[PDB]
Amino acid sequence: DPVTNICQAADKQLFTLVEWAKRIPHFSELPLDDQVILLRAGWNELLIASFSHRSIAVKDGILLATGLHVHRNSAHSAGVGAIFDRVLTELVSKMRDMQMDKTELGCLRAIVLFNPDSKGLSNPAEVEALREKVYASLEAYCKHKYPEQPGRFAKLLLRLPALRSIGLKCLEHLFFFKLIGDTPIDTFLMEMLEAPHQ
Amino acid sequence: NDPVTNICQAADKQLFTLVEWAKRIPHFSELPLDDQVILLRAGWNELLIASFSHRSIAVKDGILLATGLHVHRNSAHSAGVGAIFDRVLTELVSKMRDMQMDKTELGCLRAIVLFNPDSKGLSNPAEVEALREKVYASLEAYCKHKYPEQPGRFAKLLLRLPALRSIGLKCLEHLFFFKLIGDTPIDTFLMEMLEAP
Amino acid sequence: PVTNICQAADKQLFTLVEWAKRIPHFSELPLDDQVILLRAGWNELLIASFSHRSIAVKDGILLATGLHVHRNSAHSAGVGAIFDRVLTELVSKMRDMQMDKTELGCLRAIVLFNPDSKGLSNPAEVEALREKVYASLEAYCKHKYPEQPGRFAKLLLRLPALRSIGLKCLEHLFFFKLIGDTPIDTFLMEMLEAPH
Amino acid sequence: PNDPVTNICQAADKQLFTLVEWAKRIPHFSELPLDDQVILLRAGWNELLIASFSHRSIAVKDGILLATGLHVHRNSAHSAGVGAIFDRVLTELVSKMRDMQMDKTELGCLRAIVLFNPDSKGLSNPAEVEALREKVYASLEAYCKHKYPEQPGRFAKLLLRLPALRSIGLKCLEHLFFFKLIGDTPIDTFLMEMLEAP
Ligand SMILES: Cc1cc2c(cc1-n1nnc3cc(C(=O)O)ccc31)C(C)(C)CCC2(C)C
Ligand SMILES: Cc1cc2c(cc1-n1nnc3cc(C(=O)O)ccc31)C(C)(C)CCC2(C)C
Ligand SMILES: Cc1cc2c(cc1-n1nnc3cc(C(=O)O)ccc31)C(C)(C)CCC2(C)C
Ligand SMILES: Cc1cc2c(cc1-n1nnc3cc(C(=O)O)ccc31)C(C)(C)CCC2(C)C
Ligand SMILES: Cc1cc2c(cc1-n1nnc3cc(C(=O)O)ccc31)C(C)(C)CCC2(C)C
Ligand SMILES: Cc1cc2c(cc1-n1nnc3cc(C(=O)O)ccc31)C(C)(C)CCC2(C)C
Ligand SMILES: [Br-]
Ligand SMILES: [Br-]
Ligand SMILES: [Br-]
Ligand SMILES: [Br-]
Ligand SMILES: [Br-]
Ligand SMILES: [Br-]
Ligand SMILES: [Br-]
Ligand SMILES: [Br-]
Ligand SMILES: [Br-]
Ligand SMILES: [Br-]
Ligand SMILES: [Br-]
């Protein structure tokens, strides 16, 4: 059953995301409730950023961690072609064109994680300071590794608004729900209907 | 501990419980199997909402799940879904309680919802529509017989369906179930892992 | 034609209020409650109105201004999904059962008398007026269409469709987009070519 | 007068025109193809206006200062059913602007960056728009380093308000922010006078 295969894969991603967050310096020093808030507030953009960057090698598609390629045809057939194109044009291709490396990706995800605008944070200023610490490092990295590109640091930060809106649209249009195709849903129900009864 | 899979398994039960209920509805299984699937997908959200709303008549300021779990208004607002929780209580639960909607009337309303001829992709909508017509014909007869002093009770039942429609949409829109049934197992899982090395 | 559109909306708002006032017992309600009901319902009320007006029309919607809007424009404007929901769930259903204007008026009166509206000082009063209305609608259906005992319910069971379609219309900016890109682009181009 | 909808349309007409005149005074903007100028304005007018009254509202407390001089307090917003976004505007934009003392030169640059959005759909030459954006934030960085050298991270802090502006912009359109704030009273007044009439 593809459904349980999907569900445990999500459990796996949640696991890997938390472990990644704990490896981020000073994150675990935050109040436990604040750590949960940041994860819940960011795990959508964080995952989108991840598979977008992973999909630089792929053409007209998205590369999942499970190795599964999702082409734009499936997306448009699933009724989410607009956002899929938004992901490809505003994130994937932009990452490809500027050759965003994994260090830069990690910093951007760290910045996203340290979102001081998240509601219910007991100490936003503490979170803000950690974000400041991160992009200070990112600028240093960009300056030394790409000195012929003085504007690279800003270009990285200016992908974040796109990630913000795309993240919202993805939830709005049930992006992940619909990228299973609802064949797994139909199959799931058909199995239920054909089961023994009374 | 595996929160997402636990959550999917819990949804698995409710869907199945709903499937068994649907097959016990007369003439439903006589429909094309594809159309049966279509109706369930189109209706499962409102069908479940109608169920726990009526089940929550005994409860105050809260919702009673089939799993026996009592959910309070505090938790809902704290989970960020307090607006819908209130509309569920005001537009469905309290209205059901006030008019003393019985189990037979609830079953018919859910049968009407199930037999939705507006569902997309139905091979024979007229067939589904005919089954709906047969259902609310019965419901009217029941209401006039058991509550003759209330001539307008039949319509009052039908006029809860628009509320159920909108509330159903908002519930999906604001991830109602995910935030209600799924918050605690996930938060527990995260907190355990965060306190670990 | 932006000002044409704005003035047309002003006209519709006017006609809707006047229609509401001619509805019995409506004006006897508290004034703040009358406002609440209008705001809560004016979307579904208008949708019901042009849907029924569009029965004569094929694959399209007939506006009060006489403007015909085809299915092509809607899908090109990116709102073809709802447009089809309007046509299939409302317009064609109204056509098939030959819903007359008396039945339409009652349904809109029921919508207007929505006791679920937020902030109502006396919901029970509003609910009572709704009860008065559909009691009358049943009597009308029984006498004019006695060979159709289920017609009354069939009318009421269009209201959930109207409810969802009303919501979808708002979130997808249905009215905004049915003017198209052109009136807005024209509007801005005029601004840009103006002196500086 | 009467006709509340037309009054409301006229007011929006005025604001957009003010925005068009501002855009034309931005260097190299008018040199773009006219169709591209329209696209950028449609794509950006919402965030551009939000950025404007947010910064204008630095002087006021628990409220928003409109160009017409009208003060809108938080409770009217909550009473109008748009209190959630109003708080997001005050917290994520207004107070942040006030705290860091964002000047009008920095505000103008940020709006110029927003205006020069290369992610806008249908642009005939996105690279041309992107180049103009690059020119702008290059200038903004120079300005920040010159005027606020004791604040090395000020440039990034400015850019990192743009994701907030992006999401707040979307929510504002989604919840009919302007309509419920600007249009509630003139419409309610009109209805009220009609209802008390014969
Ligand atoms: C797609 C997806 C979304 C989420 C989650 C997980 C996923 N999943 N599920 N399977 C995935 C697989 C990939 C992948 O292969 O790249 C990315 C995300 C995935 C968690 C469980 C972290 C909750 C947060 C949301 C709902 C955003
Ligand atoms: C709500 C939801 C459920 C699931 C999934 C995803 C979601 N989604 N989808 N968007 C979401 C957004 C959030 C959120 O940001 O809070 C939480 C869950 C979300 C995946 C894709 C992980 C499959 C597993 C199930 C079906 C449980
Ligand atoms: C029924 C149900 C559906 C879903 C979800 C959960 C449910 N579940 N799961 N357990 C439930 C228990 C009840 C109940 O006790 O009433 C209702 C719905 C329930 C999640 C949270 C997984 C999101 C995915 C969908 C929306 C399919
Ligand atoms: C489309 C439309 C919507 C609304 C309004 C008005 C309209 N308009 N505007 N022109 C219309 C024309 C028709 C029509 O021809 O049927 C219906 C509605 C119309 C008012 C002014 C009542 C405010 C309430 C909302 C925004 C729902
Ligand atoms: C927000 C809005 C504005 C306008 C119009 C419609 C709206 N919309 N669109 N959806 C709305 C929904 C509501 C509402 O339900 O409150 C109010 C106004 C709405 C029409 C179509 C009447 C043209 C006139 C202007 C452009 C002022
Ligand atoms: C700018 C603006 C836009 C709109 C509307 C209103 C405005 N207006 N109108 N006057 C405004 C005044 C300000 C302001 O003081 O900053 C901002 C936006 C304003 C309505 C209410 C007509 C909804 C339709 C759209 C969204 C086009
Ligand atoms: Br999109
Ligand atoms: Br950029
Ligand atoms: Br966007
Ligand atoms: Br709600
Ligand atoms: Br009612
Ligand atoms: Br739709
Ligand atoms: Br029906
Ligand atoms: Br301006
Ligand atoms: Br919000
Ligand atoms: Br400015
Ligand atoms: Br920040």
UniProtKB/Swiss-Prot annotation, chain D:
Full protein name: Retinoic acid receptor RXR-alpha
Induction cue: Down-regulated by aging. Induced by pulsatile shear stress.
The NR LBD domain, residue ranges: 1-198
Main location: nucleus
One of the record's GO molecular function terms: transcription cis-regulatory region binding
Lineage: Eukaryota, Metazoa, Chordata, Craniata, Vertebrata
Family: Belongs to the nuclear hormone receptor family. NR2 subfamily.
GO terms under biological process: cell differentiation; hormone-mediated signaling pathway; mRNA transcription by RNA polymerase II; negative regulation of transcription by RNA polymerase II; nervous system development; peroxisome proliferator activated receptor signaling pathway; positive regulation of bone mineralization; positive regulation of cholesterol efflux
Keyword Transcription regulation: yes
Annotated keywords: Acetylation, Cytoplasm, DNA-binding, Host-virus interaction, Isopeptide bond, Metal-binding, Mitochondrion, Nucleus, Phosphoprotein, Receptor, Transcription, Transcription regulation, Ubl conjugation, Zinc, Zinc-finger
Assembly, per entry: Homodimer. Heterodimer (via C-terminus) with RARA; required for ligand-dependent retinoic acid receptor transcriptional activity; association with RARA is enhanced by pulsatile shear stress. Heterodimer with PPARA (via the leucine-like zipper in the LBD); the interaction is required for PPARA transcriptional activity. Heterodimerizes with PPARG. Heterodimerizes (via NR LBD) with RARB. Heterodimerizes with NR1H4; the heterodimerization enhances the binding affinity for LXXLL motifs from coactivators. Interacts with NCOA3 and NCOA6 coactivators. Interacts with coactivator FAM120B.
UniProt comment concerning the protein's domains: Composed of three domains: a modulating N-terminal domain (AF1 domain), a DNA-binding domain and a C-terminal ligand-binding domain (AF2 domain).
Organism per entry: Homo sapiens
Tissue-wise expression: Expressed in lung fibroblasts (at protein level). Expressed in monocytes. Highly expressed in liver, also found in kidney and brain.
Gene Ontology CC entries for this record: chromatin; cytosol; mitochondrion; nucleoplasm; nucleus; receptor complex; RNA polymerase II transcription regulator complex; transcription regulator complex
Outcome after substituting residue 20 to A: Abolished ubiquitination and degradation by UBR5
Residues of the full protein shown: 261 to 458 of 462
Subcellular location field: Nucleus; Cytoplasm; Mitochondrion
The protein's role, per its UniProt record: Receptor for retinoic acid that acts as a transcription factor. Forms homo- or heterodimers with retinoic acid receptors (RARs) and binds to target response elements in response to their ligands, all-trans or 9-cis retinoic acid, to regulate gene expression in various biological processes. The RAR/RXR heterodimers bind to the retinoic acid response elements (RARE) composed of tandem 5'-AGGTCA-3' sites known as DR1-DR5 to regulate transcription. The high affinity ligand for retinoid X receptors (RXRs) is 9-cis retinoic acid.
Region annotation (Required for nuclear export) ranges: 88-108
Effect of residue 174 to N/Q/K/A: As a heterodimer with NR1H4, impairs interaction with coactivator NCOA1. Impairs transcriptional activity
Amino acids binding 9-cis-retinoate: 56, 67
Amino acids binding all-trans-retinoate: 56, 67
Modification after translation (UniProt): Acetylated by EP300; acetylation enhances DNA binding and transcriptional activity.
